[PDB]
Scaffold this active site. Structure first.
Site, PDB file in Angstrom:
ATOM      1  N   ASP A   1       0.944  54.078  -0.521  1.00 47.64           N
ATOM      2  CA  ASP A   1       2.219  53.231  -0.600  1.00 47.64           C
ATOM      3  C   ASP A   1       3.480  53.841  -0.103  1.00 47.64           C
ATOM      4  O   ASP A   1       4.061  54.497  -0.863  1.00 47.64           O
ATOM      5  CB  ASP A   1       2.385  52.905  -2.055  1.00 47.64           C
ATOM      6  CG  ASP A   1       3.499  51.854  -2.295  1.00 47.64           C
ATOM      7  OD1 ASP A   1       4.145  51.249  -1.197  1.00 47.64           O
ATOM      8  OD2 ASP A   1       3.899  51.432  -3.358  1.00 47.64           O
TER       9      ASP A   1
ATOM     10  N   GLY B   1      10.250  52.646  -4.757  1.00 47.74           N
ATOM     11  CA  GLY B   1      10.616  53.372  -3.448  1.00 47.74           C
ATOM     12  C   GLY B   1      11.437  54.528  -3.817  1.00 47.74           C
ATOM     13  O   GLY B   1      11.484  55.243  -2.944  1.00 47.74           O
TER      14      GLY B   1
ATOM     15  N   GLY C   1      12.828  47.676  -9.794  1.00 45.98           N
ATOM     16  CA  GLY C   1      13.700  48.017  -9.057  1.00 45.98           C
ATOM     17  C   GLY C   1      13.941  49.281  -8.735  1.00 45.98           C
ATOM     18  O   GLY C   1      14.715  49.870  -8.030  1.00 45.98           O
TER      19      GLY C   1
END
Ligand code: F5X
Ligand code: CA
Length: 223
Positions: free
Chosen positions: A84, A178, A175
């Site tokens: 990922d 990443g 949120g």
């Protein structure tokens, strides 16, 4: 970030916000032209926002730069979240300064017990939703791979690690995806997945960046 604290404006100068009309993911600036984020953050129309604290107010240290290319890891599997990781190239180089700074990639894989810093603009509640304006931070230790696998049987690959707290209450959340996990001043993790946020016996799971340094370096040398 649930159970964290307000970082302090621009104290995490490698943290970026990915914006598609609204903040939707974090990322990490690794040099003047490239951001590392999660593959599950891929979408079209990304503007990278650097130098942010309050994402709803222009405070004067921001740089807003469109993405010119996104490169999702060739082996990313969106069902298992294995691999990922994604690279985002900026249309123009960021101007590096005290509020906009790159974070170094790791040379080795960080060890269980190491204290790390996780940051983002994600949900601050483990039940319900509340989204902050200013950047939130969480200090969290890397967990042993045995404890990580016990928490998520059948789901932890060699490209993942757990960090946080088995008692719950402190975790990354929706949120924060990443965004960075930084240990000893190096980017060791990317906010990847979990079972909810800050739930008992369900610590956050993070992409193990040290496994991707060769791919990152070769990709940025050719794009
Ligand atoms: C849709 O809800 C969520 C809730 C939490 C997370 C995380 C971090 C979990 N530690 C990454 N993606 C998420 C999506
Ligand atoms: Ca701002």
């Amino acid at each position: 970030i649930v159970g964290g604290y307000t970082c302090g404006a621009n104290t995490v100068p490698y943290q970026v916000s990915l914006n598609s009309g609204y903040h939707f993911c974090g990322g990490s600036l690794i040099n003047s032209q490239w951001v590392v984020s999660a593959a599950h953050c891929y979408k079209s129309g990304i503007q990278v926002r650097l130098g942010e604290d309050n994402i709803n107010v222009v405070e004067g240290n921001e740089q807003f730069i469109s993405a010119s290319k996104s490169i999702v890891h060739p082996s990313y599997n969106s069902n298992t979240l294995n691999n990922d990781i994604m690279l985002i190239k900026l249309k123009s180089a960021a101007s590096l300064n005290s509020r906009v700074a790159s974070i170094s990639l790791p040379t080795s894989c960080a060890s269980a017990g190491t204290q790390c810093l996780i940051s983002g603009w994600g949900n601050t509640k483990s039940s319900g939703t509340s989204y902050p304006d200013v950047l939130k931070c969480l200090k969290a230790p890397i967990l042993s791979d045995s404890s990580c696998k016990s928490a998520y049987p059948g789901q932890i690959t060699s490209n993942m690690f757990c960090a946080g707290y088995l008692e719950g209450g402190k975790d990354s959340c929706q949120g924060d995806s990443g965004g960075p996990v930084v240990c000893s001043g190096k980017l060791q993790g990317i906010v990847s997945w979990g079972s909810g946020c800050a739930q008992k016996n369900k610590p956050g799971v993070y992409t193990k960046v040290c496994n991707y340094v060769s791919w990152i370096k070769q990709t940025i040398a050719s794009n």
